[PDB]
Design a binder for this molecule. Structure first.
Ligand SMILES: CC(C)N1CCC(NC(=O)c2cc3ccccc3n2Cc2cc(-c3ccc(Cl)s3)on2)CC1
Ligand SMILES: [Ca+2]
Lengths: 234, 53
């Protein structure tokens, strides 16, 4: 996360972190329930083998509330393409259930129609993660969060050098130096409504980080709700 | 702004217009309250809530 603030105690409890064999975080994820984690499909290619850490806010210190979980099943969307990053979505089934507590809790999955007309028409959403604090910087050791404005779909397409499919949406600022970044991918994009947070997106990609005239590109969760339910049912 | 377009139909969460008139519902882990608008947590750590303890 470039800019923004660090997540305070209990503020981003649905945050999950995918870690490689050497215990390094490379992607984010969103806790959907005790057994399921939502992340990006392209993240599945960053590591041949990985696990999921929850309840983590500071990667270099322990506050016995963190927990590592092995992945039992990786459910990737069969239509994902590295060419355009379309269908950048995946669901992870954990071997053991997540025990909810302080800093560990699931985000809510909304209904499509309501989410699209009410949630995505709100002024802002919230993205978070352990990603780079600057485009060329290194990974953050502190979990961060950033309020990102929803970006008009037209302006989104006009600003991108890459095709923006119906499974993606823009969020962020035109020139202000705040945006998600490398490391935050697969992470949560949630929208607050009456103090309840709903999953509205998955950190997908961007042309650099916080670049002027460019926005953050997220997978449009509302387009995969039925798919997500299917994946969790099985 | 008439039904769900007017202040979310006074619903805490999901709002849908069925044969005119507002109908509220909630996410898994919540139950619609008696006023048929508010959503009450079924148990501890309901989804979408920042942990206060
Ligand atoms: C053609 C499509 C398929 N393609 C997908 C990958 C895109 N490249 C990146 O992704 C990327 C570019 C890039 C440049 C400097 C530093 C980090 C970078 N990342 C990695 C990166 C940057 C981010 C985000 C920035 C804002 C967000 Cl929201 S996610 O997350 N990971 C380029 C366009
Ligand atoms: Ca820690």
């Amino acid at each position: 996360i470039v800019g923004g603030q660090e997540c305070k105690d209990g503020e981003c409890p649905w945050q999950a972190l995918l870690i490689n064999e050497e215990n390094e975080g490379f992607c984010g994820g969103t806790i959907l329930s005790e057994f399921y984690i939502l992340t990006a499909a392209h993240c599945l290619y960053q590591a041949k083998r990985f696990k999921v850490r929850v309840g983590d806010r500071n990667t270099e210190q322990e506050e016995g509330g963190e927990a590592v979980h092995e992945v039992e099943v990786v459910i990737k969307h069969n239509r994902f393409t590295k060419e355009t990053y379309d269908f950048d979505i995946a669901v992870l089934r954990l071997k053991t259930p997540i025990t909810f507590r302080m800093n560990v809790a699931p985000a809510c999955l909304p209904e499509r129609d309501w989410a699209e007309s009410t949630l995505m028409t709100q002024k802002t959403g919230i993205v978070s993660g352990f990603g780079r604090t600057h485009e060329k910087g290194r990974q953050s050791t502190r979990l961060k969060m950033l309020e990102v404005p929803y970006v008009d779909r037209n302006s989104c397409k006009l600003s991108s050098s890459f095709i923006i499919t119906q499974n993606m949406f823009c969020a962020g600022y035109d020139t202000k130096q705040e945006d998600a970044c490398q490391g935050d991918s697969g992470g949560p994009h949630v929208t607050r409504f009456k103090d309840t947070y709903f999953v509205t997106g998955i950190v997908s990609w961007g042309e650099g980080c916080a670049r002027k005239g460019k926005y953050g590109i997220y997978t449009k969760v509302t387009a995969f709700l039925k798919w997500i339910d299917r994946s969790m049912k099985t | 702004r008439k039904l769900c377009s007017l202040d979310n139909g006074d619903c805490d969460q999901f709002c849908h217009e069925e044969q005119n008139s507002v109908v509220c519902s909630c996410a898994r882990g919540y139950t619609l309250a008696d006023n048929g608008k508010a959503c009450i947590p079924t148990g501890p750590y309901p989804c979408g809530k920042q942990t206060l303890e």
